[PDB]
Amino acid sequence: DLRPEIRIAQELRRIGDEFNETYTRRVFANDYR
Amino acid sequence: MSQSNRELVVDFLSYKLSQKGYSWSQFSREVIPMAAVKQALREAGDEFELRYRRAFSDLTSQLHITPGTAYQSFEQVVNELFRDGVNWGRIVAFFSFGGALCVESVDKEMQVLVSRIASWMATYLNDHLEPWIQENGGWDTFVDLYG
Numbered sequence: 001d002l003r004p005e006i007r008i009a010q011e012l013r014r015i016g017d018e019f020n021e022t023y024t025r026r027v028f029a030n031d032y033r
Numbered sequence: 034m035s036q037s038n039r040e041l042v043v044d045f046l047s048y049k050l051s052q053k054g055y056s057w058s059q060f061s062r063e064v065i066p067m068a069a070v071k072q073a074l075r076e077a078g079d080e081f082e083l084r085y086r087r088a089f090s091d092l093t094s095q096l097h098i099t100p101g102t103a104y105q106s107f108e109q110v111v112n113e114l115f116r117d118g119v120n121w122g123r124i125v126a127f128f129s130f131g132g133a134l135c136v137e138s139v140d141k142e143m144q145v146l147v148s149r150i151a152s153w154m155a156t157y158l159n160d161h162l163e164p165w166i167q168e169n170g171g172w173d174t175f176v177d178l179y180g
């Protein structure tokens with residue numbers, strides 16, 4: 001029951017955070033040197 | 034605030050418009066070249082879109098975009114996206130959203146919105162994202178992490 005602007009914005013937030021976690025995880029996983 | 038943000042917005046929007054067969058006038062290492070920043074953003078945007086493009090489907094219809102209501106809808110979406118924090122992924126989502134709004138507006142013969150959206154994006158970057166960007170290593174760091 002969310003207005004369009006909020007529904008879209010929160011979907012962008014969720015996928016944006018997921019995307020962020022993906023790259024953060026890649027850095028930590030490969031920084032032995 | 035630097036002119037870098039506007040440069041990134043124009044490059045990114047021009048790039049996304051090119052992927053839809055459109056050409057836009059574009060008018061209206063602790064240190065790296067902006068060319069590398071643009072490239073990193075283009076790449077992140079593409080990976081982001083390939084993974085989640087269903088989220089940008091018919092935004093113009095969903096948000097009932099018209100020239101007179103575009104600004105408000107854009108601002109509300111971006112303000113809520115960053116309501117509880119900022120991070121590089123959300124910034125990529127922000128660029129992707131602006132790109133999709135631009136492409137979909139041209140698709141509906143509302144091409145006048147491209148330069149406007151570009152301006153609203155630059156302004157949001159400089160007035161609400163720049164403080165965080167600078168405190169988090171700047172674009173140089175975005176590249177180090179997403180490049």
